[model samples]
Every structure is written in C-alpha cells, then in structure tokens.
Target: ARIRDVQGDITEFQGDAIVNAANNYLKLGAGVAGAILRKGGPSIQEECDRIGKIRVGEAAVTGAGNLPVRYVIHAAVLGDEPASLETVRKATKSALEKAVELGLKTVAFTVGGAWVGGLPAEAVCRVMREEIKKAPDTLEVTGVHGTEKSAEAPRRARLEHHH
Candidate 1:
C-alpha cells in the first residue's frame, strides 16, 4: 500500500503481481499482453499457452519471469477475439478476487483497449474506471441473531422480479 497509480496496462505499474487482461484462449496478442511479453519475456507467453484455454471470467497464475514482479495473474476477460463488455467486467472482478484469495496486498490494472463494444477506447476506459470502483460482495450463512435469522436464510433470496 505504498502508492496508487493508474495506467494503460498492468505492467506499467511495478507491483508484487500483474494482472493480464487476456482472452478465453489466453493468447498474448495486443494491449496488455503485448506489453507484458515485450518486457517480461517470451516465457510469459509460453506459460500462458501451457494454461491452454480458460473460460471467460476465469483467471490463471504464472511466474513473471523477467518482469518486475513475482507472478503474473492472467484474467480471461473475453473470448479469443471480439471481446464483450460483460465478460471483460467479470474478468476484472475475478482477477481482483484472485488477488485477494492469494493474500496479495496490491494489484494494478489499466485500460488495455480490450473492454466494451461499439464504443471508442476512451469511452471504454471511462466506463471501466467507474466500473472498477465497485467491488463485488460475497455472503456467508453461518448464524444469525434477530428473529432467529429466519429459517429461509438470506442465501435463499433471489433477484427474480416479482412483476
């Protein structure tokens, strides 16, 4: 937690681990992947290829090799090509979750020109800037006090519209 800075790619910021905004196939193409491979090393790409393919919104971890970090967290935000907004957003959130799960203190992500569709890159960045501010919440059902916590339990609640 020394400093917080924003940039266009995760590698731009030196940190313990960098999150790679990759597609489902996890290929090192344009955007963040390109920069990381250029600086980190070809091994990064090889490791990612070893990961084979990942589902959208999923992530994988590997050594940073020659990069300025211990590891690289690759989050699949889109399909092989023609990325989508929903998948990109989910991938970003999942990456954050992975970071927390790994007990990492800090992470860096940026607009890699791989988010949102039918919009300019700047607009996509603006949306992502706002979107990333919101963190997803996880709920656990262990016990409760008031009203005996209701036998139904909050976990059973659904978002379905009643109409």
Candidate 2:
C-alpha cells in the first residue's frame, strides 16, 4: 500500500508516469486530459491525436513531455455518459499493467475522487494491491480477467495437489 495514496488531485502525486483519464476518441479538451495538456505541453495531445480513436476501457501510452514523468498512460475510464464503476476499475488496472510492462515501478492516478464518479479510491486501490501482490513478475501481464476467474477456480484445486 506504500505505492498508493488518496489525493484530492492526481497532479499532486509524483511518479514515473501519470494515468490520464481520456475519452475513447483521445480528445484533450477537458477534465484530467486538459490539465495534463496544460502542464505536460501540447505534445501529449499531438501524440494521442495521432493514435486516433480507442475503445472504452482500453489505454495508450505517451511521453509525459513537460511533466515530471518519462511516460503517461492514457486510460479510457468512461463509457459514453453514465460511466460504470466496472469500466473505471478495468481502466485503472489496465493502465497500471501498462506502466509495469514498461519497466516502471511507480505511477500516479486519480479517480477524480469518490463523489465525482471516479471509482471510490479505496475500491480501485484494493484491486490494484491484490493484483500486484499475486504477481511474481511485473512482466506477466494480463487484462480484465474477472470473467475468467470462475474457470480458474478449478485450477486452484489443481494447485492444491502439489502438496
């Protein structure tokens, strides 16, 4: 949990990269995307814009430019209007996995706070903590596997046979 913290603003946290909650279209117009552009420079938008549209719950990475970090993880945390908390969780985990994939041990994120439709900070943090704790290698990457958990329940039984 040392890697996690609750902040009123995501910009306040310092890390190797920051998770940007971006629209699927990669627009840098408002919200956290706008703040990152204003601080990290327009190159962030230029990089994203070049990539074109993305699917919801997906993420893309880019240079932090003027920001303190070397990279930025643009997580699509919304599903049109009335974004679901499940999408928010998937986006956060996906973004964090991207950071680890890049050999980064530190990253920053903001759910916009519990009242703002950003996943409750604690909920997302716990998910992150549990995932990280279970992994032995940062390179062993996987995406929203919640649906597969049921299938793996039997796999756990097999692991018990090792004893």
Candidate 3:
C-alpha cells in the first residue's frame, strides 16, 4: 500500500512534490530535468540557481513553478562523474526525508540516475523501493516511469459508479 509503481509523464503525475534527478550543480540541463523546467516554468530553475550546488547524494527543496506539485526536491545523485548505487541510495532516502519534513504525505520519484549516467531504471527503482520501505507508510511514495505502456493510472471506479 505504501509503494506504487506507475508509468506516465512525471510532470503530469500530481503529488505533493516530485524528485528531480539532479547534478551536483542542480542545473536543469536536459532529459527529465529539462522537461520539468520547460513545463514547470523558469521559477524552478531560479530556485535551483539560488540554492546553488547541493552535495552529491543529498538534496534540497524548492517551490515548483507551473507544475501541479507544491514543491520540487532536487536530489543530487551525480557530480563530475556518473552516479553509483550508493549515491542513488543516499539520494532516495534524502528525498523522502525532505518530503516528510515538509509535512507532505505524497511524493513522486523518478529514476535518479537513468537519463544521464545510464543507470538502469529498474535498478534505480529497486534501490528506491528498499529505501521507501524504511519510511512510515503514512507517506505514499509514487514511482513514476516515463514509459507509456507500464504507466499506472489513477483508480476512478468508485467515482464512476452510479445507482
């Protein structure tokens, strides 16, 4: 009940906040970051630039722009080099903590090292799932896969029911 795996555009996944697979410099360069920046608007990038560099494997929070989420947690899983399993692990935990710290119960995550460092999405999800289990179930963690076929949709069965 605590962990959910879904496929869809992470930007469209509504939650309290979403995790950004970030660099140490927290630049919204390309891939998921770019998409977020493009749709979320310049405010997100401005917040990142203002926050400056984050420690690899740690994270920082900022307000989202035009995105549906209330906040964006930028998890730094890379530096000059690509991410290691350990870094991804650290980042996953940190992002969760950041959300909980904000009194948020729902948060979404993307594969922390998938786009840039070539870390397989499955491996990243595996690590993230493990970290998520350590947290309380009060927090609903959503794993957003950018794939179409595997993306899980919200359940609207009850809403559709009519007497």
Candidate 4:
C-alpha cells in the first residue's frame, strides 16, 4: 500500500490514471470535472458523454485526451444530493477498482466530497485516506491539489510504501 499526499493540481500529476470527482450524469461542468476538461481537453468530456450516467458510487474510465496520463477514472461522488461519507468511500474504492482493472500502477485523486459537495475537509480527508490505504500494494495513490486555503489544505503523508 503506497501513498503520497501531494499539494498540487491533479491534472498535472504524472501517473497511469487520475480520478475525477464527477456527478452521476458524467458531465464535465464544475469542480474537478471542469479542471480536468480544461486541461485534458473536451474529448475527455465527449468520452464521458458516450459512457453516460452512473450510480453515485459508480465510476467510468476514459482516455485522458490531452492530459499527461493514459486514462481518467471519473468517480461519481454525488448524484441527486451533496456528498456523504458513504459516497466518498464507494467512489474512492470504485475508482481504485477501475485503475486495477486497467493495470494502472499509479493514480492521483483530488480530495473528494468536500469542495463541490459540501462535506467537511477533515471528514473527507479521513475517508479518502482510509479508502486509499485499502488499495493493493501494487498501486500508488497520490492526493493532489487540496483547496487553496492554507488552513483547509489537504493533509500530506510520506510515501509509506513503493515499488
């Protein structure tokens, strides 16, 4: 179980995949989705549209388009309501599953469920850390681009384990 908590943009993280906090409809409109689309290009959104909607806990994979990574795992952290701890757990785990399914060795994810969904940063970080720790030893998870505010910035942890 390798993890590195980094304070930077998720889209710029170099890895096999990056996780996008998405809505159930899979549209690249705001928050992580918007940032991803802006950097990765509209083709990413087009692929997402092709895949269509998913349950709140579900996730889908698509090409990263112009981004540096090979793929992006769009995790539906919220559907009809604001994010919850349960939703965060499901989304993080589901994203990990998709990455493993794709044989990806590294993945970068934003702090899920706090910024756009109204959950507290500490609560979201706790869930995200635990969920990410559950990943297989073969995969490396990096938490990137926490909120800009210094007080609300995401916690950073050392790379505990690595290849």
- TM-score top scorer: 4
- lDDT digits (tens) for residues 1-163 of candidate 4: 5767656788788889988787888887676668889999989988988998889988899999889999999888877864878888898899999988988898987764333367676677767778888888789987775555522343332324434
lDDT of 1 by residue, 1-163 (tens): 1223322335545566776666778788875578888888999888888889989878888778788777787878767545666666667667766766776755655434454444465445434434445543331111111132332332233233434
> What RMSD, rounded to one decimal, does every model reach?
13.0, 9.6, 7.0, 4.3
Residues 1-163 of candidate 2: C-alpha lDDT, one tens digit per residue: 1233332344444567777677787777566567778888989888998988888878889888788778888888665753566676667667766877888766665444321354454455445445444443433322111124422433343345432
What residue pairs clash in candidate 1, if any at all? none
lDDT of candidate 3 over 29-106, digit per residue (tens) = 778888999989999999999999978888999998899999999988888666887888898888888888998888
Residue 162 lDDT in candidate 3: 39
Cα miss at 87, model 3 (Å)?
0.4
Lowest lDDT block of 10, candidate 1: 139-148
Consecutive 10-residue window with the lowest summed lDDT within model 4: 150-159
TM-score of each: 0.66, 0.67, 0.85, 0.86
Q: Name the lDDT of candidate 2.
A: 0.61
Give all candidates' CA lDDT scores: 0.60, 0.61, 0.79, 0.78
Q: Is candidate 2 or candidate 4 better by TM-score?
A: 4
User: Which stretches of model 2 miss by more than 4 angstroms?
Assistant: 6-9, 113-163
Q: How close is candidate 2 to the true structure, as a TM-score?
A: 0.67
